[PDB]
Amino acid sequence: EDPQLLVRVRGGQLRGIRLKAPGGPVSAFLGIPFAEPPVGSRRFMPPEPKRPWSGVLDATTFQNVCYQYVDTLYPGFEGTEMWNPNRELSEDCLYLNVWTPYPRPASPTPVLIWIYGGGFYSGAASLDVYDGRFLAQVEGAVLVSMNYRVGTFGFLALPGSREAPGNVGLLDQRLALQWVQENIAAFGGDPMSVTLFGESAGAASVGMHILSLPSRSLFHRAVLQSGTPNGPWATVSAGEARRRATLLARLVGCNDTELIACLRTRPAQDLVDHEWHVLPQESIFRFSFVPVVDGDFLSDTPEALINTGDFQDLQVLVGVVKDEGSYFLVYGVPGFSKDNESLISRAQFLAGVRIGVPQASDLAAEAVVLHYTDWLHPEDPTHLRDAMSAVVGDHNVVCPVAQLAGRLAAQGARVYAYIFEHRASTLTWPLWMGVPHGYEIEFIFGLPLDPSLNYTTEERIFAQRLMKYWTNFARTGDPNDPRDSKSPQWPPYTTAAQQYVSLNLKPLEVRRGLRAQTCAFWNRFLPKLLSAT
Amino acid sequence: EGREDPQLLVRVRGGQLRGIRLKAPGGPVSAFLGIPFAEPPVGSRRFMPPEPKRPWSGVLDATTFQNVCYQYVDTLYPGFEGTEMWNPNRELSEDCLYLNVWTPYPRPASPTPVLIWIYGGGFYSGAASLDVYDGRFLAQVEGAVLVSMNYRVGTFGFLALPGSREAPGNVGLLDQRLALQWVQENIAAFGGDPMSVTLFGESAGAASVGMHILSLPSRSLFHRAVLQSGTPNGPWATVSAGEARRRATLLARLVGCNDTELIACLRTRPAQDLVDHEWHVLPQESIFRFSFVPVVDGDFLSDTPEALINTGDFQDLQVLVGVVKDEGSYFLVYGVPGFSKDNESLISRAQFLAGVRIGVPQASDLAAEAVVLHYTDWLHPEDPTHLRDAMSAVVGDHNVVCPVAQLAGRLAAQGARVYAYIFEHRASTLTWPLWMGVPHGYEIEFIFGLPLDPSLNYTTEERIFAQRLMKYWTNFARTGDPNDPRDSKSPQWPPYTTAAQQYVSLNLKPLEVRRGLRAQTCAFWNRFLPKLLSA
Ligand SMILES: *[C@@H]1O[C@H](CO)[C@@H](O)[C@H](O)[C@H]1NC(C)=O
Ligand SMILES: *[C@@H]1O[C@H](CO)[C@@H](O)[C@H](O)[C@H]1NC(C)=O
């Protein structure tokens, strides 16, 4: 009975398991319950804290993945399967995982908390790309990740109802945050230094915790990778949430109480079977059940809240990958496949824009097409294909991020910004997608440090830099190596200079303006064009 | 005659003329100045189409420039060379329909290709007697036959009550056309070839050339065309019948006045009264907008230039078109608040947004925001230096560069052989501030070969640059191709095409081919904007 792998939290005792990291062992405590299972009549409900348990809870394996849609686009293909559930699906999924150094940290170690993405309809803390052993071993970090309910189970709301209030998936995340405050010290973590980080919907979730007062007392810094609370896909209005809820009730044969009761009696998979059929138009990068502006968790829209918020003692690191948009195109944009080079016609390009900006009037769609056309080569399919990707990435990630960065900087926050431009040598997607949404994660978690994975040696040294930036930021709110001259320095992002850095195999390069002209189009012009139809 | 120079006596359809032997750096030229080509458009003929000049008796002296067409005189900067060089340099008069001819001396052996200059000046000003329009250098150095005419400007040239008999509109254009006919009938007497006539002009001169291309009756009077910094399409060169009627009647009101009775009253007002009120009839505070311009009458212009270029066949047509680097700067100092020739005109963002409302007077609030968003440098949105240059670019792009881009595109796509350039050399002798760069109108002195006059103080490289230009221009007149058939060592100037969109730069360095004439931005103006303000 190894004492290092024994811990006492408020609910009782846990036994973790010693794991092998390339350069040493780490303590891992997997599958810790932080809430009463959200099953039966608890479905759609805010989480309750897990009840105490007798004896020693075996905490040595990953628990169930939250019930969610499973991808079929490219069955067997690693590039998609790597995102699929790698454990059994269950509504009983409210568990977190903790990795520490082995032996346990002598003094209180900064805590990093990972929040996975997946459009708010999928994701699991157990995926290999989120393996915390590397940062724990190498940077001596204490790392936490949780599951939170997705799709209908986490975000289906009948706003104002008692039995489907909305945002329960975010409440799951908040509950795990509180658990970390109350328990992390037992593991050698510092509850007074907690950094959230996440990607895609995970980044947006972090963003929402920034924008929701009750969450604020639970962390000190935030890292948002390729996702924001603001923007087209991350939130919906109370009205539109009510709309999608009842339409789904209808699709499954169903006053709120009555409706919600009948929904609670449907097998999980019946709900998932119609998840995708409540969307108001044909679209990409749009998801059926996501956080809802309820005047509660979110008191106003994210855009309102970031405009008027005070972000004084906040430090935030934000960034995007070189090709945010490409991944989404193969999911139903006519012309795109991972198999051909998806060179497209001008006709397909226009068609793709109606889908990419589902909310756009004819005139607005025209404006997008004109802005993104290369008038020197208005009909070259390589340009058209790339352009289609940029529309999607820019509309949904880059410009929302540029927007957020500016507002936080302007309003007191210390902001650091990056763009990730290195395509992994082991990447299974076609070259034309470049560096897609999701593919910086393996580097930040340090997977290339595992030799059996067959990353080049440069990628290994890269991974080490990234882990150092992230953990430095975690320790100090500044990504820069606190004793190290010349890189040169990573400068803060400010509305004036608008400096950000390029993360790739070459040393840090400071650039100015994150797509400034194009984000002006998306952030400043398009809105006028639509709020005037 | 008897003791007169025998090579300066020439007969034309209306009578005998005596010309003058002028000095040019490389030798003498024959000049015939102030040849009347129309009945004085005075009295009951004001606003009326020109009638051919009635034959005269004896030898008409053609040794000096004639009256300049009655017009507004610039007062912005008294005595300043930069403005004065464009001001009238002869007595103002409604009796002003005269043309000028320059030929080699003695006159050429075989029939020489003919160049015809049409001065610009917003359709409210201009004169063929200005120094920058001196044909003596092209005639001497290139052996060209060069012809320039006066045509009526302002109210006298363009005030229209469309439909009416006494003020049909476009008579200024008709003055121009009559001089073209005059050249057809008479230019052989000077050694000119009526079978080889090239039109060239600048600003409203260029738009004029454009309208002759779009007007059937003019089509048979010339073979090739050059448009410098101007087009028949675009926002300032024409008005609808409705708008011209409106401006015509508003002006009559302003001076104290059934169209017949209205026009009849106007014909009694002194020319100066008309000039003194012509700027007051514009719909909005604006730059690069003129009160009295060609009207779309379903006659001279059968439809809009925009329409006609979109649908006409231009198989048989060669055209050279271009722009200067800084088309807009000149206009900013005429009443965009913040700008002056005496300081750097560094402006504020507020002054930039105010300037945009003025430069795009037709623009709704949304359209003007679009313009400002497109032109703001979002890295330095407050930088007074980018704002000043952006303001100049807005004016230049909207009024010239994008209409010209649009024109070259449509013409090439429909038959024409098109050559395109941007002129980028600031004259060492320029009196305007550096911030203005290469302003509207400042290529002209090079094309006409002024730097060849030793007393002028141009640099030697400029003197050589001028010769290159005169060469491209005359080569195009002769052949429909600017390129020297001999010189293949020198880099070639390729036609402009929808496919490649190639054009050359014109500076002290050798020809450099570039691709895309402000393509992205011109998409904004030519494709997006029109659709926008249909809302
Ligand atoms: C330049 O001159 C004009 C007129 O005198 C003036 O209105 C403008 O403000 C001046 N610019 C500056 C900033 O000195
Ligand atoms: C050219 O330079 C000479 C020498 O100073 C000067 O006297 C003359 O006036 C100048 N001519 C012009 C046109 O400026």
Coordinates of C-alpha atoms in Angstrom, one line a residue, chain B residues 10-416:
Chain B
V10 CA -2.6 77.5 -96.0
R11 CA -6.2 77.3 -97.3
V12 CA -9.1 75.6 -95.4
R13 CA -12.8 75.1 -96.2
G14 CA -13.6 78.5 -94.7
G15 CA -10.8 80.5 -96.2
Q16 CA -7.1 81.5 -96.3
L17 CA -5.0 81.4 -93.1
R18 CA -1.6 82.8 -92.2
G19 CA 0.3 80.7 -89.6
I20 CA 3.4 81.4 -87.6
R21 CA 6.9 79.9 -87.4
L22 CA 7.7 79.0 -83.8
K23 CA 11.0 78.1 -82.2
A24 CA 11.3 74.7 -80.5
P25 CA 14.6 73.4 -79.0
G26 CA 15.3 71.2 -82.0
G27 CA 14.0 73.5 -84.7
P28 CA 11.0 75.5 -86.1
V29 CA 7.4 74.4 -86.1
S30 CA 4.4 75.7 -88.1
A31 CA 1.6 76.9 -85.9
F32 CA -1.9 78.0 -86.9
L33 CA -3.7 79.4 -83.9
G34 CA -7.2 80.7 -83.4
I35 CA -8.7 79.1 -86.5
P36 CA -12.5 79.5 -86.1
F37 CA -14.5 76.3 -86.6
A38 CA -17.9 77.5 -85.6
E39 CA -20.2 80.5 -85.7
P40 CA -19.7 82.5 -82.4
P41 CA -22.2 80.8 -80.0
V42 CA -23.3 84.2 -78.7
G43 CA -26.7 86.0 -78.3
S44 CA -29.6 83.8 -79.5
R45 CA -27.1 81.0 -80.0
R46 CA -26.2 80.7 -76.3
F47 CA -27.0 77.1 -75.1
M48 CA -27.5 76.1 -78.7
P49 CA -25.6 73.4 -80.7
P50 CA -22.7 74.9 -82.8
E51 CA -23.1 75.9 -86.4
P52 CA -20.1 75.4 -88.7
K53 CA -18.1 78.6 -89.3
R54 CA -19.3 80.7 -92.3
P55 CA -16.4 81.2 -94.9
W56 CA -14.5 84.4 -94.6
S57 CA -12.7 86.6 -97.1
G58 CA -9.0 87.3 -97.3
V59 CA -6.3 85.9 -95.1
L60 CA -7.3 85.2 -91.6
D61 CA -4.3 85.8 -89.3
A62 CA -3.7 82.6 -87.3
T63 CA -0.6 83.7 -85.3
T64 CA -2.1 84.0 -81.8
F65 CA -4.4 82.1 -79.5
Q66 CA -8.0 83.2 -79.4
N67 CA -10.5 83.9 -76.6
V68 CA -11.0 81.4 -73.8
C69 CA -14.5 80.2 -73.3
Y70 CA -16.3 82.1 -70.6
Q71 CA -15.7 80.5 -67.3
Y72 CA -15.0 80.5 -63.5
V73 CA -11.5 81.7 -62.5
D74 CA -9.7 80.1 -59.6
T75 CA -9.2 82.3 -56.5
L76 CA -8.1 79.7 -54.0
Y77 CA -4.4 80.7 -54.0
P78 CA -3.8 84.0 -55.8
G79 CA -0.5 84.1 -57.8
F80 CA 0.3 80.5 -56.8
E81 CA 1.9 78.8 -59.9
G82 CA 0.2 75.5 -59.0
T83 CA -3.3 77.0 -59.6
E84 CA -2.4 79.8 -62.1
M85 CA -1.0 77.4 -64.7
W86 CA -4.6 76.2 -65.2
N87 CA -6.2 79.6 -65.2
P88 CA -7.4 81.3 -68.4
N89 CA -4.5 83.0 -70.2
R90 CA -6.5 85.0 -72.7
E91 CA -9.6 87.2 -72.6
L92 CA -12.8 85.4 -71.5
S93 CA -15.5 85.4 -74.2
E94 CA -18.6 83.5 -75.3
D95 CA -17.0 83.9 -78.7
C96 CA -14.4 81.2 -78.2
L97 CA -14.9 78.3 -80.6
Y98 CA -11.4 78.2 -82.2
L99 CA -8.9 75.5 -82.7
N100 CA -5.1 75.3 -83.0
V101 CA -2.8 73.3 -85.3
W102 CA 0.8 72.5 -84.8
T103 CA 2.8 70.8 -87.6
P104 CA 6.5 70.2 -88.4
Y105 CA 8.2 73.0 -90.4
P106 CA 8.1 72.9 -93.2
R107 CA 4.9 70.9 -93.3
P108 CA 5.3 67.1 -93.6
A109 CA 5.8 65.3 -97.0
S110 CA 3.5 62.3 -96.6
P111 CA 0.3 62.3 -94.5
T112 CA 1.1 62.4 -90.8
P113 CA -1.0 60.8 -88.1
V114 CA -3.0 63.4 -86.2
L115 CA -3.2 63.9 -82.4
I116 CA -6.2 65.7 -81.0
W117 CA -6.1 67.2 -77.5
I118 CA -9.1 67.8 -75.4
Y119 CA -8.4 69.8 -72.2
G120 CA -10.0 68.9 -68.9
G121 CA -11.1 71.0 -66.0
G122 CA -14.3 69.5 -64.7
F123 CA -16.4 70.7 -67.7
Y124 CA -16.4 74.2 -66.0
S125 CA -13.0 75.3 -67.0
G126 CA -10.1 74.8 -69.5
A127 CA -8.5 76.3 -72.5
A128 CA -6.3 74.9 -75.4
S129 CA -4.0 77.9 -75.1
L130 CA -2.5 77.0 -71.7
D131 CA 1.3 76.5 -71.7
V132 CA 1.1 72.8 -70.7
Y133 CA -0.9 72.1 -73.8
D134 CA 1.8 73.4 -76.2
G135 CA 2.0 71.1 -79.2
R136 CA 5.2 72.6 -80.5
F137 CA 7.4 69.8 -78.9
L138 CA 5.3 66.9 -80.1
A139 CA 5.2 68.5 -83.6
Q140 CA 8.9 69.2 -83.8
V141 CA 10.4 66.2 -82.0
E142 CA 7.9 63.6 -83.1
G143 CA 6.8 65.2 -86.3
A144 CA 3.2 64.9 -85.2
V145 CA 0.3 67.0 -86.4
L146 CA -1.3 68.2 -83.2
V147 CA -4.7 69.8 -82.9
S148 CA -6.5 71.3 -79.8
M149 CA -9.8 73.0 -79.7
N150 CA -11.8 75.2 -77.4
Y151 CA -15.2 74.0 -76.4
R152 CA -17.9 75.6 -74.2
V153 CA -17.7 74.8 -70.5
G154 CA -19.9 75.4 -67.5
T155 CA -23.5 76.6 -68.2
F156 CA -22.6 77.7 -71.7
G157 CA -21.4 74.3 -72.6
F158 CA -23.7 72.0 -70.5
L159 CA -26.7 73.7 -69.0
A160 CA -29.6 71.6 -70.2
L161 CA -33.4 71.6 -70.3
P162 CA -33.5 68.0 -71.6
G163 CA -36.1 67.6 -74.3
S164 CA -36.2 71.3 -75.1
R165 CA -35.2 72.9 -78.4
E166 CA -33.3 75.9 -77.0
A167 CA -31.2 74.0 -74.5
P168 CA -30.8 70.4 -75.5
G169 CA -27.6 69.8 -73.5
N170 CA -24.2 68.5 -74.3
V171 CA -23.4 71.3 -76.7
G172 CA -19.9 71.5 -75.3
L173 CA -19.5 67.9 -76.6
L174 CA -21.0 69.0 -79.9
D175 CA -18.4 71.8 -80.1
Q176 CA -15.8 69.1 -79.7
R177 CA -17.4 66.9 -82.4
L178 CA -17.6 69.8 -84.9
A179 CA -13.9 70.3 -84.5
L180 CA -13.4 66.6 -85.1
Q181 CA -15.3 67.0 -88.4
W182 CA -13.3 70.1 -89.2
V183 CA -10.2 68.0 -88.8
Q184 CA -11.6 65.3 -91.2
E185 CA -12.4 67.9 -93.8
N186 CA -9.3 70.1 -93.5
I187 CA -6.3 68.5 -91.8
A188 CA -4.8 67.2 -95.1
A189 CA -4.1 70.9 -96.0
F190 CA -1.5 70.8 -93.2
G191 CA -0.1 67.4 -94.1
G192 CA -2.3 65.6 -91.6
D193 CA -3.9 62.2 -92.2
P194 CA -7.6 62.2 -91.6
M195 CA -7.4 58.4 -91.8
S196 CA -5.2 58.4 -88.6
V197 CA -6.8 60.5 -85.9
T198 CA -6.1 59.8 -82.2
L199 CA -8.1 61.5 -79.4
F200 CA -6.3 62.2 -76.1
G201 CA -7.4 64.2 -73.1
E202 CA -7.2 64.5 -69.4
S203 CA -9.7 64.8 -66.5
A204 CA -13.0 65.9 -68.1
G205 CA -11.0 65.9 -71.4
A206 CA -10.7 62.1 -70.9
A207 CA -14.3 61.6 -70.0
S208 CA -15.1 63.6 -73.2
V209 CA -12.9 61.3 -75.3
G210 CA -14.8 58.4 -73.6
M211 CA -18.2 59.9 -74.7
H212 CA -17.1 60.2 -78.3
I213 CA -16.3 56.5 -78.2
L214 CA -19.8 55.9 -76.9
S215 CA -21.5 58.2 -79.4
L216 CA -22.1 56.8 -82.9
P217 CA -21.9 60.0 -84.8
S218 CA -18.4 60.7 -83.3
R219 CA -17.2 57.1 -83.9
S220 CA -16.3 57.7 -87.5
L221 CA -14.3 60.8 -86.8
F222 CA -11.3 59.1 -85.0
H223 CA -9.6 55.8 -84.9
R224 CA -7.8 55.5 -81.5
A225 CA -8.1 57.0 -78.1
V226 CA -6.1 57.9 -74.9
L227 CA -7.9 58.7 -71.7
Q228 CA -5.7 60.2 -69.0
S229 CA -7.2 60.3 -65.4
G230 CA -10.8 60.3 -66.5
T231 CA -13.7 58.3 -67.7
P232 CA -17.2 58.7 -69.2
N233 CA -18.5 56.4 -66.4
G234 CA -18.1 57.2 -62.7
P235 CA -19.8 59.6 -60.4
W236 CA -19.0 63.1 -61.7
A237 CA -18.9 63.0 -65.5
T238 CA -22.6 62.8 -66.3
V239 CA -26.0 63.7 -64.8
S240 CA -29.4 62.2 -65.5
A241 CA -31.9 64.3 -67.5
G242 CA -33.9 64.8 -64.3
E243 CA -31.0 66.2 -62.3
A244 CA -29.8 68.5 -65.2
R245 CA -33.3 69.9 -65.5
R246 CA -33.3 70.5 -61.8
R247 CA -30.0 72.3 -61.8
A248 CA -30.9 74.3 -64.9
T249 CA -34.1 75.6 -63.3
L250 CA -32.5 76.3 -59.9
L251 CA -29.8 78.4 -61.7
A252 CA -32.5 80.3 -63.6
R253 CA -34.1 81.1 -60.2
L254 CA -30.8 82.2 -58.7
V255 CA -30.2 84.8 -61.5
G256 CA -33.9 85.9 -61.7
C257 CA -35.9 83.7 -64.0
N258 CA -42.4 76.4 -70.4
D259 CA -38.7 76.1 -71.2
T260 CA -38.7 78.5 -74.1
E261 CA -39.5 81.5 -71.9
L262 CA -37.1 80.3 -69.2
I263 CA -34.2 79.9 -71.6
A264 CA -35.1 83.1 -73.3
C265 CA -34.7 84.9 -70.0
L266 CA -31.3 83.2 -69.3
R267 CA -30.1 84.3 -72.7
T268 CA -30.4 87.9 -71.5
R269 CA -28.3 87.5 -68.4
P270 CA -24.6 88.6 -68.7
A271 CA -22.2 85.7 -69.0
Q272 CA -20.6 86.8 -65.7
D273 CA -23.9 86.4 -63.8
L274 CA -24.2 82.8 -64.9
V275 CA -20.6 82.0 -63.8
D276 CA -21.1 83.8 -60.5
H277 CA -24.0 81.4 -59.6
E278 CA -23.0 78.1 -61.2
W279 CA -21.5 76.5 -58.1
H280 CA -24.7 77.1 -56.0
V281 CA -26.8 74.4 -57.7
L282 CA -25.1 71.3 -56.4
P283 CA -27.3 68.9 -54.4
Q284 CA -24.8 68.5 -51.5
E285 CA -21.5 69.9 -50.2
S286 CA -19.1 67.9 -52.2
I287 CA -15.7 67.6 -53.9
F288 CA -15.1 66.3 -57.4
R289 CA -18.6 67.3 -58.4
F290 CA -19.4 69.9 -61.0
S291 CA -22.7 71.7 -61.6
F292 CA -22.9 71.4 -65.4
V293 CA -21.7 68.3 -67.2
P294 CA -22.7 66.0 -70.0
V295 CA -26.4 65.0 -69.6
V296 CA -27.7 61.5 -70.5
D297 CA -30.2 62.7 -73.1
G298 CA -31.0 59.5 -75.1
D299 CA -29.3 61.4 -78.0
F300 CA -25.6 62.2 -77.8
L301 CA -25.6 59.6 -75.0
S302 CA -28.3 57.1 -75.8
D303 CA -28.0 55.4 -72.3
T304 CA -25.7 55.7 -69.3
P305 CA -22.0 55.3 -70.0
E306 CA -22.2 52.5 -67.4
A307 CA -24.8 50.7 -69.6
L308 CA -23.1 51.4 -72.9
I309 CA -19.7 50.1 -71.9
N310 CA -21.4 47.0 -70.4
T311 CA -23.0 46.1 -73.7
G312 CA -21.2 47.7 -76.7
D313 CA -18.9 45.9 -79.1
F314 CA -15.3 47.2 -79.1
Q315 CA -13.6 44.9 -81.6
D316 CA -12.3 47.8 -83.7
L317 CA -10.8 49.8 -80.9
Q318 CA -7.4 50.6 -79.5
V319 CA -7.2 52.6 -76.2
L320 CA -4.5 53.8 -73.9
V321 CA -5.7 54.6 -70.3
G322 CA -4.1 55.6 -67.1
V323 CA -3.9 57.4 -63.8
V324 CA -1.4 59.3 -61.7
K325 CA -0.3 58.1 -58.3
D326 CA -2.3 60.7 -56.3
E327 CA -5.5 61.4 -58.1
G328 CA -7.3 62.8 -55.1
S329 CA -4.9 65.1 -53.3
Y330 CA -5.6 68.2 -55.5
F331 CA -9.2 68.2 -54.5
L332 CA -8.8 68.0 -50.7
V333 CA -7.5 71.6 -50.5
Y334 CA -10.6 72.9 -52.1
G335 CA -12.8 72.8 -49.0
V336 CA -12.2 69.6 -47.1
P337 CA -11.7 71.0 -43.6
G338 CA -8.2 70.1 -42.4
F339 CA -6.4 70.4 -45.7
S340 CA -4.1 73.1 -47.1
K341 CA -1.2 73.5 -49.4
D342 CA 0.6 75.5 -46.7
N343 CA 0.8 72.8 -44.0
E344 CA 1.1 69.0 -43.8
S345 CA -2.7 68.7 -43.6
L346 CA -2.4 66.1 -40.9
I347 CA -6.0 65.5 -40.0
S348 CA -8.1 64.0 -37.2
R349 CA -10.3 60.9 -37.4
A350 CA -13.3 63.3 -37.1
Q351 CA -12.1 65.3 -40.0
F352 CA -11.6 62.1 -41.9
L353 CA -15.2 61.0 -41.3
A354 CA -16.4 64.5 -42.2
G355 CA -14.3 64.5 -45.4
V356 CA -15.8 61.1 -46.4
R357 CA -19.3 62.5 -46.3
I358 CA -18.1 65.3 -48.6
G359 CA -16.1 63.1 -51.0
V360 CA -19.0 60.6 -51.3
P361 CA -21.9 63.0 -51.3
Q362 CA -24.4 60.4 -52.6
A363 CA -23.6 57.9 -49.8
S364 CA -26.1 56.9 -47.1
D365 CA -24.9 56.6 -43.5
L366 CA -24.2 52.9 -43.9
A367 CA -22.3 53.3 -47.2
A368 CA -20.1 56.1 -45.6
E369 CA -19.3 53.8 -42.7
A370 CA -18.4 51.1 -45.1
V371 CA -16.0 53.5 -46.9
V372 CA -14.5 54.5 -43.6
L373 CA -14.1 51.0 -42.4
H374 CA -12.4 49.9 -45.6
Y375 CA -10.0 52.9 -45.6
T376 CA -9.1 52.9 -41.9
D377 CA -5.7 51.5 -41.1
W378 CA -6.9 49.4 -38.1
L379 CA -3.3 49.1 -36.7
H380 CA -3.1 53.0 -36.4
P381 CA -6.8 54.2 -36.8
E382 CA -5.9 57.6 -35.3
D383 CA -2.6 58.2 -37.1
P384 CA -3.0 61.7 -38.7
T385 CA -0.7 60.7 -41.6
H386 CA -2.6 57.6 -42.6
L387 CA -5.9 59.5 -42.3
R388 CA -4.6 62.3 -44.6
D389 CA -3.5 59.8 -47.2
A390 CA -6.6 57.7 -46.8
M391 CA -8.8 60.7 -47.4
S392 CA -6.8 61.5 -50.6
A393 CA -7.2 57.8 -51.7
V394 CA -11.0 57.8 -51.1
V395 CA -11.4 60.8 -53.4
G396 CA -8.9 59.5 -56.0
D397 CA -10.3 55.9 -56.1
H398 CA -13.9 56.7 -56.2
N399 CA -13.7 59.4 -58.9
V400 CA -10.9 58.2 -61.2
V401 CA -9.0 55.1 -60.4
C402 CA -12.0 52.8 -60.0
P403 CA -13.9 54.2 -62.8
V404 CA -10.8 53.8 -64.9
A405 CA -10.3 50.2 -63.6
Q406 CA -13.9 49.5 -64.4
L407 CA -13.5 51.0 -67.9
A408 CA -10.3 49.1 -68.8
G409 CA -11.9 45.9 -67.7
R410 CA -15.2 46.2 -69.6
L411 CA -13.5 47.4 -72.8
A412 CA -10.9 44.6 -72.8
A413 CA -13.6 42.1 -72.1
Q414 CA -15.5 43.3 -75.2
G415 CA -13.0 43.6 -78.0
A416 CA -10.8 46.6 -77.4

